[PDB]
C-alpha cells in the first residue's frame, strides 16, 4: 500500500478510476459520493443522494459527469463541471423495471446501462428516453464493459453466458458459455480481441472473439469463494481478481499461475480497478476504507 483513503461510514459497493489517472469516485451504502485525489489524499466533492441503495458508479471520460444507480431502478447524472460552484442532478433516466447493476459512459451524451430486468439499454442524456434496447438474456445482467473503440460491448448475467452486442445495429452476434454459476465481472483485453470473466465457481476464464473459443481457466484447489471483480493490467500480462475471502490475487494470463497476493482488507472486496497508464491498483472493501497498491 502507498495511500489509504478514509471518510466513508458504511459498506462500499463501487469505484471507477478517472481518465487522468488521478481522481477517483466511490459509492457507499449511504447518500454520499466522494471524488478522491490519490496524489494527495484530500477530498474534492461530496454529493448527497436521494436513495441510499447505490450499487454502481461511473466517471465520465470528459471529467465532467458521474453516474449512480441501485434498487431505485433509476440512473442519475450529476454536473460535476462548472455549475456556478456546486453539483446538482442533471437528469434521471427511468424505464427499467428491476434494479440497475452497471453503467458506463460512452460520451458526454450517451450512456449504456444494464439492469436486473434481464435487459441492457442505450440512453440519450439530452432527451432522457432510451434509443436502443438489447434483449436476449434470460437472467439478471450483473456486469458490463466497453471495447476500446466504443463500438462493441459485452455483458454477463445470472444465467451462465456472455453476449457480444454492437451499439449501432442493436443485435447480439456471438454467445460464449463455459461457467456453471452466476457471472459477476467482465472486462476486455487491452487489444480489444479478448475478455475475461469471473463467476461464483471461484474460476476465471479467458475468451477471444475471433476464434469463438475458450482459451484458459485460472483457478486453484484452495479457493472456494467467488470472484467479485476482474481487471487486466496494461499489456495484458497481469490479471487482477478480487475474492470474497478478504483477498486479491494476481495471475499470469499466458501461463495461468499465481504471481502475487494482496491482503490489507478485513472485509469482502467488492471492487478494484487499474489506471489508464497502468501505474496503480485501487481496491474497495465492505469496510469503509480504500487502498492503493504499487
Amino acid at each position: 500500500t502507498r495511500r489509504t483513503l478514509r471518510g466513508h461510514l458504511a459498506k462500499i459497493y463501487a469505484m471507477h478510476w478517472g481518465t487522468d489517472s488521478r481522481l477517483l469516485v466511490s459509492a457507499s451504502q449511504d447518500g454520499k459520493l466522494i471524488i478522491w485525489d490519490s496524489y494527495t489524499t484530500n477530498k474534492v466533492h461530496a454529493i448527497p443522494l436521494r436513495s441510499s441503495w447505490v450499487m454502481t458508479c461511473a466517471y465520465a471520460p470528459s471529467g465532467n459527469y458521474v453516474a449512480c444507480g441501485g434498487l431505485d431502478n433509476i440512473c442519475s447524472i450529476y454536473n460535476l463541471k462548472t455549475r456556478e460552484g456546486n453539483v446538482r442532478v442533471s437528469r434521471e433516466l427511468a424505464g427499467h423495471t428491476g434494479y440497475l447493476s452497471c453503467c458506463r459512459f460512452l460520451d458526454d451524451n450517451q450512456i449504456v446501462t444494464s439492469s436486473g430486468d434481464t435487459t441492457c439499454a442505450l440512453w440519450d442524456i439530452e432527451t432522457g428516453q432510451q434509443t436502443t434496447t438489447f434483449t436476449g438474456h434470460t437472467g439478471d445482467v450483473m456486469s458490463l464493459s466497453l471495447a476500446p473503440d466504443t463500438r462493441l460491448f459485452v455483458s454477463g448475467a445470472c444465467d451462465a453466458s456472455a453476449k457480444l452486442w454492437d451499439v449501432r445495429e442493436g443485435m447480439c452476434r456471438q454467445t460464449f458459455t463455459g461457467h456453471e454459476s452466476d457471472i459477476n465481472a467482465i472486462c476486455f483485453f487491452p487489444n480489444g480481441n479478448a475478455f475475461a470473466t469471473g463467476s461464483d465457481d471461484a474460476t476465471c476464464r479467458l475468451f477471444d472473439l475471433r476464434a469463438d473459443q475458450e482459451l484458459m481457466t485460472y483457478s486453484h484447489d484452495n479457493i472456494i469463494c467467488g470472484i467479485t471483480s476482474v481487471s487486466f493490467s496494461k499489456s495484458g500480462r497481469l490479471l487482477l481478481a478480487g475474492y470474497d475471502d478478504f483477498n486479491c490475487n494476481v495471475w499470469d494470463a499466458l501461463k495461468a499461475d499465481r504471481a502475487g497476493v494482496l491482503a490489507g482488507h478485513d472485509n469482502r472486496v467488492s471492487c478494484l480497478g487499474v489506471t489508464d497508464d497502468g501505474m496503480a491498483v485501487a481496491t474497495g472493501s465492505w469496510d469503509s476504507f480504500l487502498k492503493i497498491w504499487n
Binding site: D30, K32, I34, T40, N42, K43, A46
Partner: protein, 45 residues
C-alpha cells in the same frame, strides 16, 4: 496555496460527513416483508 485550500475543503467535507453520520446513527431501520396480496397496506396507515 492550492494545497492549503484543498486542505480546508477536505476538512469541511470531513466535518459535514461526521455530522451527517452522527445524525443518521440515531434512527431505527425496519425492513417490511410479507407475502403477496396479504396486507402490508393497512399496516402503512
Amino acid at each position: 496555496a492550492e494545497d492549503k485550500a484543498a486542505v480546508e475543503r477536505s476538512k469541511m467535507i470531513d466535518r459535514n460527513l461526521r455530522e451527517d453520520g452522527e445524525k443518521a446513527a440515531k434512527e431505527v431501520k425496519l425492513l417490511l416483508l410479507g407475502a403477496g396480496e396479504s396486507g402490508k397496506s393497512t399496516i402503512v396507515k
